Amino acid sequence: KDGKHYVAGIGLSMEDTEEGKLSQFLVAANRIAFIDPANGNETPMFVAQGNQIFMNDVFLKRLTAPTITSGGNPPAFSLTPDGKLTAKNADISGSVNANSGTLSN
Amino acid sequence: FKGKITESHLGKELLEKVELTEDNASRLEEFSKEWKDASDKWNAMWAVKIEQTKDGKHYVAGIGLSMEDTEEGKLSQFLVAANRIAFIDPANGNETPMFVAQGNQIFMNDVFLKRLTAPTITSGGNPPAFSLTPDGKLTAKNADISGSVNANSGTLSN
Amino acid sequence: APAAPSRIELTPGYFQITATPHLAVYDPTVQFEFWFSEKQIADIRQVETSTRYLGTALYWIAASINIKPGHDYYFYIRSVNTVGKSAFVEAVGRASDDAEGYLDFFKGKITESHLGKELLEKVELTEDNASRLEEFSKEWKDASDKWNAMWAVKIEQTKDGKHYVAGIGLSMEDTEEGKLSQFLVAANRIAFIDPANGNETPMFVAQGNQ
């Protein structure tokens, strides 16, 4: 288009390195979407586009994220790489072991 | 994204098509077509759409990669319409999947991230050990903080 | 008249809920009628009309794709005998949440499938330094007069007497409810890249269960 190129494609390959044969599945596309058509469903449940991934409810074993946000401007809760935890309320059924505290009441 | 996929070429190609109508009729299909649209520009798509009919109802599954022409430029789209998308690492003959997507749910093993934006986070369980809700609530069993706790109010037993 | 059960235990499981009752007074001559529901009904007299009839036994297990993890489902349990039915009692149950357990269940389900034994568990090629690509799309009828379809590209190689296999497959097979689709990718590195503006940095890399 107007002198600029656009290339997309999928590919499964098995190549060789000093260790042995390594397999690799690759998808180069601007938007990768997964859709479950059960009972005629059309809402995607995994859409990756522009270095961003949008997913529905997800089940996990271990997460390693240095930044976690609740969304919104003035987010509701947030954890940041400096160890900061920002929240609006907190119930703790046991003990709060802090090195310092500043409370109004 | 559902709307954008519906307003695409594969949305009415891999889906919205009702080929075959009688019971026990199954078609295996795979095409590779590039053609010029009404906008005098080329759109291309390669797809494997396999469909079956049972009790008068249609089950269609498919893989499809296309690139079409938007107003600003060419957009490429890879789509997988299936009831269960699974990724498996076969190293040393492993069969346990590491990414299973089914029914608007994604199950994964440990994952590394740069930034997460989730309103609800749960530890899993009847009474979750820890939880974070969109109303700003942090529920936990113990809280060890190496610095300062700056709060408007506090209610401690001891 | 038989009394309502004192307690109901519900063992969770991967896409499944167990249900066994227990009475304060033991009586082996009574059975239990079990009904399942997804949404709570305020009225109790129309549970028999608005809930699925799970069955009648001393205990039951409801295992289906419809039951999802992280969701609360309702069970209506009653005690019946030669005298008559008893009062209906509510119970709340959820499936398991362990992603490791669900991935083990999914490994079992994939192994108990046609692509599981197609892209894996095949020992084609035996000599060293031998490789083959094989792309096939076949539809065939099973012994149960149902049709199963599949399309798979499989790469296999041999080195120093060991087999390295990778594959990409899309299939729809027959299960006890009808037909179910599946898309399997077996490879040592699964990468998603956005090539806009000459970008090569992947935005999703799956490898080594990470």
Whether the CB of A48 is below 8 Å from some CB of chain B: the reply is no
Tell me the two tokens of residue C65: 């794709």
On chain A, the residues whose CB falls within 8 A of the CB of C191 are: 24-27
Among chain B residues, CA nearest to A1: B73
The technique by which this structure was obtained is cryo-EM
Smallest Cα distance from A95 to chain C, Å: 27
Q: What Cα–Cα distance (Å) separates residue A47 from each residue in A34, B79, C170?
A: 7, 9, 19
No. of H helices and E strands in chain C? Answer: 3, 14
- For residue A45, is it left (φ>0), alpha (ψ between -120 and 50) or beta? alpha
In terms of Cα–Cα distance, which of B122, B97, A32, A37 is closest to C104? B97
Nearest by CB: C111 against B30, B91, B95: B95
Strand pairing class (A89-92; B137-140): parallel
Report angle CA B103, B97, C150 to the nearest 5 degrees: 70
Q: How far apart are the C-alpha atoms of C36 and C14, rounded to whole Å?
A: 17
Can you read off the two tokens belonging to residue B40? Answer: 């005098």
Residue C179: closest CA among C141, C206, C207, C153: C141
Query: Under DSSP, is residue A39 helix (H, G, I), strand (E, B) or coil?
Result: helix
The answer to whether A50 faces chain C, any CB pair under 8 Å, is yes
Distance CA A68, CA A52 (A): 15
Q: Which residue do the tokens 């919205």 mark?
A: B16
Contact C187 A60 (CB under 8 A): no
B129 within 8 A of B140, measured Cβ to Cβ: yes
Q: Which residues contact B4 (CB under 8 A, 6 or more apart)?
A: A31
Which residue in B has a C-alpha nearest to residue A98's C-alpha? Answer: B145
| Nearest alpha carbon to residue C99 among B56, B86, A60 | A60
The DSSP bridge partners found for residue A22 are A15
Resolution (A): 3.0
Contacts with C11 (C-beta within 8 Å, 6 or more apart), sequence order: C17, C18, C20
Q: Write out chain B residues lying below 8 Å of A74, CB-based.
A: none
Among B105, B116, B152, the residue with its CB nearest the CB of A65 is B116
B-proximal residues of A, 51-80, CB under 8 Å: 54-71, 76-77
**Does the distance separating the beta carbons of C170 and B63 come in below 8 Å?**
yes
Alpha helix locations (H) across chain B? 2-6, 11-14
C180 touches chain A (CB under 8 A): no
Taking the C-alpha atoms of residue C92 and residue C90, their distance in angstroms, rounded to an integer, is 7
Task: Name residue, tokens 């299909």.
Answer: B29
Q: What is the DSSP string of C114-149?
A: TTHHHHSS-----STTEEEEEEEEEEEE-TTS-EEE
